[PDB]
Every structure is written in C-alpha cells, then in structure tokens.
Amino acid sequence: MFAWWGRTVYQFRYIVIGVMVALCLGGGVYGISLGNHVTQSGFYDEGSQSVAASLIGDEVYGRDRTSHVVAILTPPDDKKVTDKAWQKKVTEELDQVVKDHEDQIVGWVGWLKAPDTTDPTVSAMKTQDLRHTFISIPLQGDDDDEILKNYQVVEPELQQVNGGDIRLAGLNPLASELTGTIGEDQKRAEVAAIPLVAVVLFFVFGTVIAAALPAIIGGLAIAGALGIMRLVAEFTPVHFFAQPVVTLIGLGIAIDYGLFIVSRFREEIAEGYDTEAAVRRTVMTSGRTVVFSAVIIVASSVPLLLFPQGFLKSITYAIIASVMLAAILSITVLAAALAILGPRVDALGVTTLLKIPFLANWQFSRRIIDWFAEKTQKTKTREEVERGFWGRLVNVVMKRPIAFAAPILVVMVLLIIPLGQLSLGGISEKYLPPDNAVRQSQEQFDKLFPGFRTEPLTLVMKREDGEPITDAQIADMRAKALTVSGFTDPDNDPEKMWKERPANDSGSKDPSVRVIQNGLENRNDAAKKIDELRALQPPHGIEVFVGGTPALEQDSIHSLFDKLPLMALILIVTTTVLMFLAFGSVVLPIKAALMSALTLGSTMGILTWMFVDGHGSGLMNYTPQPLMAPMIGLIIAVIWGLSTDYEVFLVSRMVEARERGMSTAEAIRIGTATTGRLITGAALILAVVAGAFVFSDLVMMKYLAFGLLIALLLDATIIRMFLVPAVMKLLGDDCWWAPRWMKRVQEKLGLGETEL
Ligand SMILES: CCCCCCCCCC(=O)OC[C@H]1O[C@H](O[C@H]2O[C@H](CO)[C@@H](O)[C@H](O)[C@H]2O)[C@H](O)[C@@H](O)[C@@H]1O
Ligand SMILES: CCCCCCCCCC(=O)OC[C@H]1O[C@H](O[C@H]2O[C@H](CO)[C@@H](O)[C@H](O)[C@H]2O)[C@H](O)[C@@H](O)[C@@H]1O
C-alpha cells in the first residue's frame, strides 16, 4: 500500500506538487483574515448548570455592564476632586466621546455624572483624601467578542481624557491585553525562531536547499492550517489560542515531519540508489512513520473532544489540521520535490547561500562563513565521530544498564511529588506579569475602594407554569439559602442578605424567573458550598440554579476531572495500539506508554513546582497562582502526543535492523546512532519555537511552552539516550514479540510492511 503510493507519486510527481502547493497557498490569504473572526469565550462547560444559569440570568434580568470599563480619574497639580473647573473639564470630555461613539459606548455612569447625589454606592465611588474618583463605561455589543472589539475601537480616545491622566481598568481592558499577547509572541516567534530553526535545519544537512524544504514544508503547513481554521470559523466558534498552537506545535513538527523526508532520501542517495528508487525506500521507512506520527497525535488529541470546553475543542481541530496536513505535505510534496531536485539536492552548499547579501546581515554571515570553513573539515568529519559517539554512549549504557536506569527511574518519580499540590483557578489580572501597566491599575483600583469587585454565587429560580413568582415563593427559596453558612453580611442583618439582583434596561423581566445572589467567604469552599447549595431541594414549582463565576469555574474544574480518566484511558489505549501496529512489536508500546506516562507525569510536577509555588516566578517574571483547569487537560494530550512521537522515531529504526536479521543490540545501536543527530535537530527545532512562546506575558502560554520545552528535552536526552537502551536491553529478544493474530491484523491490513 505504502509502496504503491511511493511508485505512483513518482509517476505523477508534477501534478501532485501543483495540486498541493496551490491549496496550501490558497489558505494563506484565507488564513490572514482569520485574525478578525475569532471568539474569546470557551473556558466554561458549554452545556452545564452554572453556564445555563448565567444565560437565564443575563436574559431575564439583563447582562451586567457596569464592569466593562472602569476609569480612575485624578486631577493634576495635587488638586482635589471638588475643584469645579476640573469636573466640568472631564465631564465634557466624557460626554463628548460618548456622544462621538454611539454604536460603541452605552454611556458613562459615576459620581462625576451627578456630583451631588445621595445613593451611597455612587457616593462611595470617590476616595477618602479626595484625590481620585472613578467611573463606569458600559459598552455595546450582544456577544462577548463584540464588546471587546468595541472597546478596542474606543480605547485611544478614552485614554486621552483628563489629559492622559486616566487609569483604564476592568473586564474589557484586561481582555484586550490578554488577547493582545497572541499577536506579540506570534511576532517574537517570527523574529527569533524561524531563523534559528533554519540554522538548525542546515545544521543537520550540510546543504541549503535540502534544509529549506522542511522549513518550506513547515511554512506551508501553517499556511494551510490557518486557512482551515478560518473555514471552520464559519460553522462553530474558534478560539484566539488556536493561532499560536499551530505555530508552537504545527509549525515546529511540520519541519520535523519534513526533516525526516530529506534525511532518509539523502541516506538512500548515500547508499547508491537512483532517483526513481530513492523515493520508494523513503516512503516505507519515513513516510509510513510520518503518517503514524500524525495519526498518533490525532489519537492523542481527540479525547479532548470528550471535554465540554469549547476552548479545548477548538484547539484539537487546529492540532489535527496542522499535523495531518504536515504529514500529507511530507509525503505528497516533499518526496516529489526530491525527485525533481534529484541527486543535485546537495549541490548549492553554504557558499551559494552567500550569494545574496546574507553576509551583509550581521547574524547570517557568522552562520554562513562558519559552515563554509567547517565544510572542508568539521561538518563532515564530526558527523562520523558523533555517530560513533552515539554508538559508544549506548554501549556504556548497555554495559551496566541497571546503573543508569535505576537513578533515572527514581528521579522521575521524585518529580511527580509536587503534583499533589495542584491548585486550580480561573482567569484574572494575575495572568499578566505584575509590572504590567493595566494590571497595576486594576490592582490600584481594587486597593483604593474595595467592595466593587464581586464574584457572587447566583440562585436562579424559574417556573414553567408561567405564573408570576410570589414574594412568599421567593421567601421560601431565600429561607433555605440561610442554612448554608459562609456568605457575606457587612450589614450584620439577616434580612439584608441575598438581595435581588439588579435588573438591566435590556431584559424581558419574565416574572417566572427571579434571581438573588450573595458573595462567598472563602473561594476554596466554593466546590463544597455549590455542592451544598445544589444539594438543596427545589420549591413547589420552580427549579433552582447555582451560577456565578465560582460555580462557573468550579463546574469547569469539575467537568475536567470526570472525563479525564475516560480521556486518559482512550488516550493510552489508542496511542499504545497504534504503536504496536507501527513497530510490529507489543512490549515496546507497553514499555513506551510507561515512559510516556513517566515523562508526562514528571513534567507536570516541575510545572506545578515553578508555576504554583513560584520557584522561578522571580526570574521569568510572573506570579504563582492556581493553574487553568482545561490547560492541564490540554498539556496531558500534548506531552503524550510528543513523547510518543519521539519514541516512534527512536524505535522505528530498531525494528528495521531487527527484522533485517541483526541482533537486538545491533537493532538498538542502529536505531539510536543513525538518528542521534536527526532527533536532536527536531528537538532543538521545537525547543526553538517553544523557547519563543515561553517568554509570553500570558502565564498560561508560559505554562504550555515550558511543559513543551521540559518534556521535549527529556525525550531527546534521558529517554532517547539512556532509558530506552537501558530498558530495551533488559528485554533482549523480547522487544519484538507479537502474537500472529495481532501481526496478521497489521500485515493484511496493508500495514505489515516490516522491513525493506
Ligand atoms: C455558553 C457559555 C455562556 C457562559 C456565560 C457567559 C456570558 C456572560 C457571563 C458574564 O456576564 O461575564 C463572563 C465572565 O467574563 C470574565 O471571564 C473571562 O471571560 C472570557 C472567557 O469567557 C476571557 O477571555 C476573559 O479574559 C475573562 O475575563 C469575567 O472575569 C467573569 O467574571 C465574567 O463572569
Ligand atoms: C492521567 C490520568 C490522571 C487522572 C487523575 C484524576 C485525579 C482526580 C483528582 C480529583 O478529582 O481532584 C480533587 C480536587 O482537586 C481540586 O480541589 C482544589 O482545587 C482548587 C484550588 O486548590 C479549588 O477549586 C478547590 O476548591 C480545591 O479544593 C478540585 O477543584 C476539586 O473539585 C477536586 O475534587
């Protein structure tokens, strides 16, 4: 089957290049418009109680808008706010921008709009020393995304109010900055990573145009994937976080997927096979591996569709779309271009890259001239001594494999320890580095006049009869709520608790629905209190609902842990069963799934140490805080899909030598030493693109990027060099065992192509 495609792609090589390069280029312009039609919501359980309790709450009583924007105004010259000239100056400016932007701003409400009012909450908007005061600026827009796009329209004119001296904080200022980091490290990754992945590409090839093709494939893959996600946006919403993931993961491993097609072809040319035959021996040894690599990542990501969060559901689409397209790009495009370039792929060399003024550029001259001087000596000689070093290192391991596996085994287990302190939370201003201008304003806002920031649990009552709800009917539900201790009462009066939620001027006050809300005492108790509140029995007609941001996160935190074992099971069994089909062996997938579970578990214990306890918060500039619930579900699906893939690389060369007649140590040594340079490049290529996104201002992007760079490092070193050879030799001849029915399944399914 795979041999059939290798021979048809050479007979049909000109038409497959034209068809595939056109589609990846067509998605380029289409992917450019994607950056505009993208939704930010999706962190809550799309279909759940706490979620649908906010739908009814925002519908009947009205979507709250007093937290869209808050603006702290301070008069200059140490003038106090009672200065009438200052009040008239700012109020005219505030009325003007509101007058200028009708389709964006709904208005501005605050103490300045009525300087002499008796409503003490509005009166408490000023400060004590009369040095500052703030306002609320509600914004238009029906959905969450429309409101932000409106704020981004009015942000410039709103900051020049009071002559610059105005502090903008609130929900929409934060959302503008958080979604703004997506494009920042996107540029950082294109200024500092695509050159470095290029210098790693010819680090492993000794040829320029050979190195260009994985970058060409890598660049082609994201251009097609970004085109797919903009098409997907027409049906169901896509998240802002999808665009970095395609670059962080899809781009890097698309180069890796192509980094294997060029090298195996050069190895086949190095043996002495002609152009027609070289594409055949590469597809069944690299293309069959690249196909199984991506399908494994697919099988390592579809169990996230079990999770309810639309945030994760959008990501798995991009991960599926990027790696499967990159794999199809690897076989269909990269193999056909090597028949067109033919044996003259290794022609240009470094000296030809020196043609255009890459030397006039500071960085590339140093990189070019080094490869030229090393071309006559260092680049070709060091490869054999490193190939020999890779072979010598493994026999130092296999000489006393227990001496290397046992210290490695105990260390990785000792790193899973901090995972027991995994605190989970939600998005807040803390997701930004504490030196941030917006975060400090929101923090100074909260420190100036406490009591406006509230995360209250809501009780949503709804009858289906349609009759209005009596005050005695409300009194019964309000009576039951007083049994669950732990809700606030600064009034110290039990009647003053669980007030009626404010009603907006935009909600059909269907009297079948009435909602009351009160603020918790300890957010940690939410998981327990919402359980207690949901445990209360409903009224003669109505059905209760527990909502608010605590119930929203605590349900999303909960919704992860339920589907997680079913995810872990589906993930483990589908990755393991796909590795057996690839290797033909059975115990290697069972062994790899251990090492994969050994790698994934150790990495999240480091992340928990440095991100929840803050061992590194002082250096990388962030603040230790409870992690995001869908994030740990994501990073589980990623590390597994990566650890599995790099083990697919190291072992697929051993099944080649084993099924070629060689001994087990021959199979291991052939596997590790012939790849010891390839995987290290693929590791560095990702460690480059991952290193870019690690400097992100968004702490959760730091989390995903560190978890990549950490586990990717362990897969390239401790597992590839040490643990795999140590554990494999203890198996000996057992490494390749397989029941015949299990084999014949692989063999007659068109995939039992064991060796060449
Ligand atoms: C089907 C899902 C519907 C869930 C209900 C959402 C409708 C509006 C709810 C509420 O009025 O405000 C929503 C919360 O917004 C912030 O939380 C985050 O919002 C998005 C993700 O949804 C995120 O991108 C943003 O950066 C966060 O600010 C507030 O923090 C919450 O307090 C609000 O409840
Ligand atoms: C790879 C497969 C591994 C599967 C392992 C599944 C283990 C499930 C563990 C359990 O479900 O979680 C226990 C509780 O953890 C949290 O409790 C704290 O979390 C935060 C912050 O500390 C907070 O929301 C909560 O109040 C804390 O007690 C969850 O929040 C709880 O819901 C879990 O029950």
Numbering used by the authors: 1 to 756
Article sentences:
In addition to elucidating the structures of MmpL3 via cryo-EM, we crystallized the delipidated, purified MmpL3773 transporter, which contains residues 1 to 773, in the presence of trehalose 6-decanoate (T6D). Crystals of MmpL3773 bound with T6D diffracted X-rays to a resolution of 3.34 Å. Surprisingly, the data indicate that each asymmetric unit of the crystal contains 2 independent MmpL3773 monomers, where the conformations (MmpL3773-T6D I and MmpL3773-T6D II) are different from each other. Interestingly, the structures of MmpL3773-T6D I and MmpL3773-T6D II are quite different both in the periplasmic and transmembrane domains. Particularly, it is observed that TM9 of MmpL3773-T6D II tilts away from the innermost surface of the cytoplasmic membrane when compared with that of MmpL3773-T6D I. Consistent with the structure of MmpL3773-PE, each MmpL3773-T6D structure is found to create 2 substrate binding sites that are situated at cavities formed by TM7-TM10 in the transmembrane region and between PD1 and PD2 of the periplasmic domain, respectively. Each binding site is occupied by a T6D molecule. One obvious distinction between these 2 structures are the exact locations of their bound T6Ds.
The mycobacterial membrane protein large 3 (MmpL3) transporter is essential and required for shuttling the lipid trehalose monomycolate (TMM), a precursor of mycolic acid (MA)-containing trehalose dimycolate (TDM) and mycolyl arabinogalactan peptidoglycan (mAGP), in Mycobacterium species, including Mycobacterium tuberculosis and Mycobacterium smegmatis. MmpL3 consists of 12 transmembrane helices (TMs 1 to 12) and 2 periplasmic subdomains (PDs 1 and 2). Our structural data are in line with MD simulations that indicate the major conformational change of the transporter is located at the periplasmic subdomain PD2, where this movement can easily be interpreted as a rigid body rotational motion of PD2 in relation to the PD1 subdomain.
